[PDB]
Amino acid sequence: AVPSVQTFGKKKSATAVAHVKAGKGLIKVNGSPITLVEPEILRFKVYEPLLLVGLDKFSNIDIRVRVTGGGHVSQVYAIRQAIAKGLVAYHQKYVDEQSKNELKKAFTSYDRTLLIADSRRPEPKKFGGKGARSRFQKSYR
Amino acid sequence: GRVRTKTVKRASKALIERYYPKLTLDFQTNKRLCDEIATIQSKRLRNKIAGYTTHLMKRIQKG
Amino acid sequence: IIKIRITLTSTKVKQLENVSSNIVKNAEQHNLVKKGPVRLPTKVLKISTRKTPNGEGSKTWETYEMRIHKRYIDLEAPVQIVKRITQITIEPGVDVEVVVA
Amino acid sequence: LVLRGTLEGHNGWVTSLATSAGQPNLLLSASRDKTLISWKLTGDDQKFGVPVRSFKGHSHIVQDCTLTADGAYALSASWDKTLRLWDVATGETYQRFVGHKSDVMSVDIDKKASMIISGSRDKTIKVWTIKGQCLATLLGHNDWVSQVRVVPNEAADDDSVTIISAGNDKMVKAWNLNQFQIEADFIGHNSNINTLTASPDGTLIASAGKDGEIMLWNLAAKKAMYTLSAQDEVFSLAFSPNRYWLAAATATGIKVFSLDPQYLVDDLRPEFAGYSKAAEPHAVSLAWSADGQTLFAGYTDNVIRVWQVMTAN
Amino acid sequence: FTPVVLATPIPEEVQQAQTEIKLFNKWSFEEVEVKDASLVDYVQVRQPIFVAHTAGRYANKRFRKAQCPIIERLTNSLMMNGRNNGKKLKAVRIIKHTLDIINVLTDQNPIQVVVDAITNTGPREDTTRVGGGGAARRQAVDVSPLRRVNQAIALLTIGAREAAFRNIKTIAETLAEELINAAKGSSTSYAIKKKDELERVAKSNR
Amino acid sequence: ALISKKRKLVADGVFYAELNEFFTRELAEEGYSGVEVRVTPTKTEVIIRATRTQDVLGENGRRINELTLLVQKRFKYAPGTIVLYAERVQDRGLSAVAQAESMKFKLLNGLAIRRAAYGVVRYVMESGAKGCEVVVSGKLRAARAKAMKFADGFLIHSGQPVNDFIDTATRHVLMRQGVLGIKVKIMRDPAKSRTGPKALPDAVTIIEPKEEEPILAPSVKDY
RNA sequence: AACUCCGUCGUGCUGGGGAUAGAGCAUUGUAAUUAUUGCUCUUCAACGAGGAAUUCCUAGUAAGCGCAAGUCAUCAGCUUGCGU
RNA sequence: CAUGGCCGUUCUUAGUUGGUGGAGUGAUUUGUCUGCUUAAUUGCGAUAACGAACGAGACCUUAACCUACUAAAUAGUGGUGCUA
């Protein structure tokens, strides 16, 4: 009954949630098409999961992504995190597992953290400076 | 900076000299044994104790 | 029967979780629908004083924290058993309020 | 007894293999990487088989796996103190078994899929229903129950089921589920008993462990028959179903023992490229095929090796 | 090329050039090659990328920045002098405009023009300082292959920044002018004038 | 009610600190060591941790009925909604607050500093402590201040186990020459600890194995 | 908020910069003069990248960018944190 | 510059001290070290020292992982009604 997988993708505060169900082939982000994700110079960043494995694989599935948090650049890195995980986890459940490795091999060999979210996290500020490492200027006389 | 200290090192030698024919050469089933044959306060320490135990056994069965 | 709600607030994790455990244990001793413990996000109350009296020395700062843990359980019960379960589980450090409806 | 290739696709030690009598080319393997993989054997020298479905959902090492006779249902025993009942098709879990206080080391099911037995590291053995109900706790070991097996009863379906439960306490115990009581006790293992098995007919008991020895027993007779020596720490143990052979997984290689007469069939040492003598990969799981011509051996190479019997001339 | 139709249109110019070859913005990483040995394994044009925006960890090891593609190492060096720090989405636009302008003035592959600029404008013999006591004499030394790539990107983007500063021509065009005039040894570029000046100083001090 | 829990839980803290400083000042001569409040419906109750309860509980109910009024007058409680109990002390040889007041009042009777302080450290060691340390700092016998420290056993002061096994107390003793400072640190051993951790974090105990029989008599025993 | 897109400007101390100053309207306050602060129009200074010196910094760091809290009735060009 | 308490600093480092034995008339010394190693008096070892104690580490908080457990109209998601 309506074979569907939900998954998530993350970058730095952002959490995109993907809803990968079987269907006709609409790929919509926040209710709007994937062709409208607009920093418009990172528009191809949501396009690598659609082009590394080929556009044919999306002809029978439906994608619906919602993002919150993060920034304009951090969110763009979060849809592609969720699209890639949303297709390899669809294939783990509803089609042959041999095909899952072939797509997992494609994304990992081009790893811009499509499947594995990076562990770089902000360092806390300290006293005596305006940043984590930066210190105030000292005067010495 | 991976030097074990005399808490981990001295405990592991004492744990081999009386439990030698119970410990394997595998870490994952050595740390499960360290919960039974020893009382160690923190999870971080018994992973360090069982890891050095597993390292010592690899050079016991060599010589 | 009546719809009730019990709200628990404390600064001690160990003293609060067992009180909520006694609440639910008395809840299925004589069975009734739970709507069990929904833990609210913990509140960290920060006070950042400097370090010192008078401002001599390096400008060193402290931060002090009080942690507020809050839990509410939404029960329904006959009127009789309400008072006894609200009075048995009384422990120092845990503040319990019961909303009638 | 020659190999025609390997199986790749696991990222950890392949801890247990299990095959089904129904489908002769359906192999189920559970590994250290918290997953189970159901394969499809093709009989090709380059790729003897391919994976078709991965069963993920265990939080830690999956120590033992078993199939049913018809191969539709699968059981997984894992270190997360739970057991899971899987559908081999569509990869979902119907029932989760909970109640062990420690790691679950083994799982077995009877032929009629009525009771499920499970050894553990909590020194207890629990008998489960098909809907996740724990019937009784067959305590009585003094250490970790390293592996359990259910003995296949004799013909005409007599109502008497016995299970055999090795442990680190150096006793093999035969249990009686008709009364949930201990039936027989076997004494004489001088080290940890890693593995044990039973004959297809359900009379022989073979058990082995750390000392480098295998002891054959007779549950029908309740006498120990004799012991062998393998000079290597014994990991797994498997009876051939029709050839009347006993396969043993050792630290050095697969040693196949014939008992009529008493001699060694073969000592299987695969060719490993790029390792040293001390860092020698070894088999930690054995499974004879249902038809009886093929044995499988999961390794610490994270790679399943396939051996099938062939007459020399 | 047998286009695929689906509920989201995904316009025709997108998948036609990208399903089979993963190009640049629209540019090819095929038939581009480092003409100068001792800069192979330090100029990375071997794994193609779509845009020069790769949130990659290249600082955590000594030589991992060599595996960063050199187009991103030019967008990284544009975010400089303070008011432009952390403004990478502006730097990709400049580079996207630069490779379009480079193709217009000379009809070769603009990726190839960049590699020609890097291979030329790296110093080949540099000078270090020997203190002793007093006069602090200089000593001529060699220069690493990695530092040659590190300094060539430095000199090119500094020269484009200084040329475009109080000028009506944009930073994209002056970066294009600097890269074209450095692909040949024209000595009308900031980097080539700098490179042979550093080399002739070391020649005196050898 | 009608107060946020952030202001409610903080106000409970400052109420406790005001009560504690009151009883240190008031029951100084009775060896007071602490309080705890039990905020219950129907008469929230207060327990006083003082050694000589026969002095804290005065003649015929005085000297604690007085203190019951003093608390409910100052904190605007309804009458009868607060009661004051006095259970004595759990092992007064191991409380640093009680042993600092003992050190303070021994000084005010004109005891020598080295004798009053070695009589406190040896009492705490007699009480099953693993280590304690007493510091006296001030103008001891001269016009220029010095600091004398008296120790026995061992003390750990490194980390989280300080919050577990160290009890500290500071007291200002008022003398003819000026003010002396009293600091008492007591490290109760973790073996007799009832709650929380019962050992130092880097303490490992190996369970001694029982030796077995080699041959083990290969045979079967049946039922 | 920086940022992104489209347009106006066009190498000119210019539509950069907004110091100094004039007139009005409000807000907090018992009270605003020695402008508390906010807003509207007008006024349009130096400053064209800073000598000897000298500070901080090794990765989600430096730097850019704002936001909350402390102080508070009103006043943040400061600090303590936080994210982009 | 008569003090208590608090704080800064020496001091972003690895340092400090008993007991018994040995050396020296003694102040003191050895232990606490040639070498190698470590962020570390961290270890391997050497050894007139042996066995110890504080500091370092261990510890606690916090940030990263969990398609695992416990369930949430004060957090969501999907279907279902009604409806644009």
From Swiss-Prot, chain A:
Location in the cell reads: Cytoplasm
InterPro entries membership: Ribosomal_Su5_D2-typ_SF, Ribosomal_uS9, Ribosomal_uS9_CS, Ribsml_uS5_D2-typ_fold_subgr
Task: Indicate where the modification Phosphoserine is found in the sequence.
Answer: 32, 59, 74
Where does this protein have compositionally biased stretches of type Basic residues?
Answer: 132-141
- Gene3D superfamilies, A to Z: 3.30.230.10
Q: Which GO terms describe its molecular function?
A: RNA binding; structural constituent of ribosome
Where is this protein chiefly located? Answer: cytoplasm
Any idea which UniProt keywords this protein has? Acetylation, Cytoplasm, Isopeptide bond, Phosphoprotein, Ribonucleoprotein, Ribosomal protein, Ubl conjugation
Against Pfam families, the record matches this protein to: Ribosomal_S9
> Renumbered to this chain, where is the cross-link Glycyl lysine isopeptide (Lys-Gly) (interchain with G-Cter in ubiquitin)?
28, 45, 57
Region feature Disordered, mapped onto this chain: 121-141
Q: How does it assemble?
A: Component of the small ribosomal subunit (SSU). Mature yeast ribosomes consist of a small (40S) and a large (60S) subunit. The 40S small subunit contains 1 molecule of ribosomal RNA (18S rRNA) and 33 different proteins (encoded by 57 genes). The large 60S subunit contains 3 rRNA molecules (25S, 5.8S and 5S rRNA) and 46 different proteins (encoded by 81 genes).
Primary role: Component of the ribosome, a large ribonucleoprotein complex responsible for the synthesis of proteins in the cell. The small ribosomal subunit (SSU) binds messenger RNAs (mRNAs) and translates the encoded message by selecting cognate aminoacyl-transfer RNA (tRNA) molecules. The large subunit (LSU) contains the ribosomal catalytic site termed the peptidyl transferase center (PTC), which catalyzes the formation of peptide bonds, thereby polymerizing the amino acids delivered by tRNAs into a polypeptide chain.
Q: What is this protein called?
A: Small ribosomal subunit protein uS9A
Q: Which organism is it from?
A: Saccharomyces cerevisiae (strain ATCC 204508 / S288c) (Baker's yeast)
**Lineage, uppermost ranks:** Eukaryota, Fungi, Dikarya, Ascomycota, Saccharomycotina
The encoding gene is RPS16A
Swiss-Prot record, chain B:
Q: Where in the cell is it found?
A: Cytoplasm
- Which top-rank group of organisms is this from? Eukaryota
Family to which the UniProt record says this protein belongs = Belongs to the eukaryotic ribosomal protein eS17 family.
Other comment: Present with 30900 molecules/cell in log phase SD medium.
Which proteins does it associate with, and in what oligomeric form? Answer: Component of the small ribosomal subunit (SSU). Mature yeast ribosomes consist of a small (40S) and a large (60S) subunit. The 40S small subunit contains 1 molecule of ribosomal RNA (18S rRNA) and 33 different proteins (encoded by 57 genes). The large 60S subunit contains 3 rRNA molecules (25S, 5.8S and 5S rRNA) and 46 different proteins (encoded by 81 genes).
User: What does the function comment of this entry state?
Assistant: Component of the ribosome, a large ribonucleoprotein complex responsible for the synthesis of proteins in the cell. The small ribosomal subunit (SSU) binds messenger RNAs (mRNAs) and translates the encoded message by selecting cognate aminoacyl-transfer RNA (tRNA) molecules. The large subunit (LSU) contains the ribosomal catalytic site termed the peptidyl transferase center (PTC), which catalyzes the formation of peptide bonds, thereby polymerizing the amino acids delivered by tRNAs into a polypeptide chain.
User: What's the protein called, per UniProt?
Assistant: Small ribosomal subunit protein eS17A
Please name the source species. Saccharomyces cerevisiae (strain ATCC 204508 / S288c) (Baker's yeast)
Gene designation: RPS17A
From Swiss-Prot, chain D:
Which GO MF terms are attached to this record? G-protein alpha-subunit binding; GDP-dissociation inhibitor activity; protein kinase C binding; ribosome binding; translation regulator activity
- Gene Ontology CC terms, in alphabetical order: cytoplasm; cytosol; cytosolic small ribosomal subunit; nucleus
Principal localisation: cytoplasm
What InterPro entries is this protein classified in? G-protein_beta_WD-40_rep, RACK1-like, WD40/YVTN_repeat-like_dom_sf, WD40_repeat_CS, WD40_repeat_dom_sf, WD40_rpt
Instruction: Cross-link Glycyl lysine isopeptide (Lys-Gly) (interchain with G-Cter in ubiquitin): give the residues.
Output: 40, 47, 101, 131, 155
Where do the WD repeats start and stop?
9-49, 57-96, 99-139, 141-185, 188-227, 229-269, 278-313
Q: Which GO terms describe its biological process?
A: cytoplasmic translation; G protein-coupled receptor signaling pathway; maintenance of translational fidelity; mRNA destabilization; negative regulation of gene expression; negative regulation of glucose mediated signaling pathway; negative regulation of translation; negative regulation of translational frameshifting
Q: Which UniProt keywords apply?
A: Acetylation, Cytoplasm, Isopeptide bond, Phosphoprotein, Repeat, Ribonucleoprotein, Ribosomal protein, Ubl conjugation, WD repeat
Per the record, residues carrying Phosphothreonine are 90, 162
Gene ablation phenotype (knockout): Defective activation of the ribosome quality control (RQC) pathway.
Taxonomy, superkingdom = Eukaryota
Specify whether Transcription regulation is a keyword of the entry. Answer: no
Q: Where can this protein be found?
A: Cytoplasm
The family annotation for this protein states: Belongs to the WD repeat G protein beta family. Ribosomal protein RACK1 subfamily.
Q: What else is known?
A: Present with 333112 molecules/cell in log phase SD medium.
Q: What does this protein do?
A: Component of the ribosome, a large ribonucleoprotein complex responsible for the synthesis of proteins in the cell. The small ribosomal subunit (SSU) binds messenger RNAs (mRNAs) and translates the encoded message by selecting cognate aminoacyl-transfer RNA (tRNA) molecules. The large subunit (LSU) contains the ribosomal catalytic site termed the peptidyl transferase center (PTC), which catalyzes the formation of peptide bonds, thereby polymerizing the amino acids delivered by tRNAs into a polypeptide chain.
Name of this chain's protein: Small ribosomal subunit protein RACK1
